[PDB]
UniProtKB/TrEMBL annotation:
InterPro entries: GH, Glyco_hydro_5, Glyco_hydro_5_CS, Glycosyl_hydrolase_5. The lineage of its organism: Bacteria, Bacillati, Bacillota, Clostridia, Eubacteriales. Belongs to the glycosyl hydrolase 5 (cellulase A) family. Residues 27-301 form the Glycoside hydrolase family domain. This is Endoglucanase family 5.
Length: 330
């Protein structure tokens, strides 16, 4: 009987198993160890209630027109889903670095739609009997790689085609029955962008009451993502800018009865844990006041500088940034 907003609130706060099943050609390909139950237990013990499990399917899909997903890969994905589910957390299962075959142009739409139907049909069938703690996310950051608008919310054409892709995925999921008839489903804007036009052009498939919007927002960019940007965050201007961004999401979606999960946020290590914790504390608390649940991007990289978003050392089961983790889960 739960509503989408009740689900989002129950999810509380999440952690991404990044650079893992989303790596290629296999789980260890980008330097992370094979995931264990003990790693996921650490997540639960810290107080997270959601794990997002990004999965890149491309390397595991056979030739058209069957597009068969390798059974051993599905079996491994299910092992990882089970770590999370057996710990009584929400699991988000997606498609991830799949832009090679998911291409949002009118010219590529028919072929991508067909493959999405075949691929989501197999994923959904395998996972159909899980309860509502398993959430499907149709697409990660669907976009045209290399286009000028890739990180600016796309174009009218690509935003239109993404709506068709999300609709195809939702219909395919629901068509498989069992608990997929009522499973909660996350769908992104173009690139999961918070750009005004990306959010304005999103159409919820079938106006389905069990669809949640997925957005990614590593704000503020210069502090959080840019290795050349400032290493300090705090104070009234920084709070005002972030509150403004969260309020735009609240005003567009949440206030109108459309729930939102920020399925990726985070900051890189600039030897600046205090600033990173100040940011996370404000981000998570202000998002929650606006009904929005957040999910930290952890790629297993905790050295200093570019792309080091990891906060758990998976190899020795140690939280590297203990003040930061505590601000995320409080
Ligand atoms: Cl200031």
């Amino acid at each position: 009987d739960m509503t989408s907003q009740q689900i989002v609130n129950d999810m509380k706060v999440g952690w991404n198993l990044g650079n893992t099943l989303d790596a290629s050609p296999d789980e260890t390909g980008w330097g992370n160890p094979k995931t264990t139950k003990a790693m996921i237990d650490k997540i639960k013990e810290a107080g997270f209630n959601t794990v997002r499990i990004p999965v890149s399917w491309s390397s595991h899909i056979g030739a058209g027109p069957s597009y068969t997903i390798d059974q051993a890969w599905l079996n491994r994905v299910q092992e990882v889903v089970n770590y999370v589910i057996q710990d009584h957390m929400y699991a988000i299962l997606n498609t991830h670095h799949d832009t090679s075959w998911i291409i949002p142009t009118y010219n590529k739409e028919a072929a991508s739609t067909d493959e999405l139907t075949k691929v989501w049909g197999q994923i959904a069938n395998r996972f159909k009997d899980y309860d509502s703690h398993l959430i499907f996310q149709t697409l990660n950051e669907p976009r045209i790689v290399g286009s000028p608008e890739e990180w600016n919310g796309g174009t009218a054409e690509s935003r239109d085609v993404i709506n068709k892709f999300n609709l195809t995925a939702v219909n395919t999921i629901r068509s498989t029955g069992s608990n997929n008839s009522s499973r909660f489903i996350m769908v992104p804007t173009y690139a999961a962008s918070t750009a005004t036009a990306a959010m304005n052009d999103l159409v919820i498939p079938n106006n389905d009451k069990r669809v949640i919007v997925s957005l990614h927002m590593y704000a503020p960019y210069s502090f959080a993502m840019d290795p050349k940007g400032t290493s300090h965050w705090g104070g009234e201007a920084d709070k005002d800018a972030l509150d403004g961004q969260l309020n735009a999401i609240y005003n567009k979606f949440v206030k109108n009865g459309q729930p939102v999960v920020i399925g990726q946020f985070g900051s890189i290590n600039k030897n600046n844990e205090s600033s990173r914790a100040s940011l996370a504390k404000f981000y998570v608390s202000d998002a929650r006041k606006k009904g929005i649940t957040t999910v930290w991007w952890d790629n297993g990289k905790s050295a200093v500088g570019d792309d080091n978003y990891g906060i758990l050392d998976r190899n020795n089961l140690t939280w590297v940034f203990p003040k930061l983790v505590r601000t995320i889960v409080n």
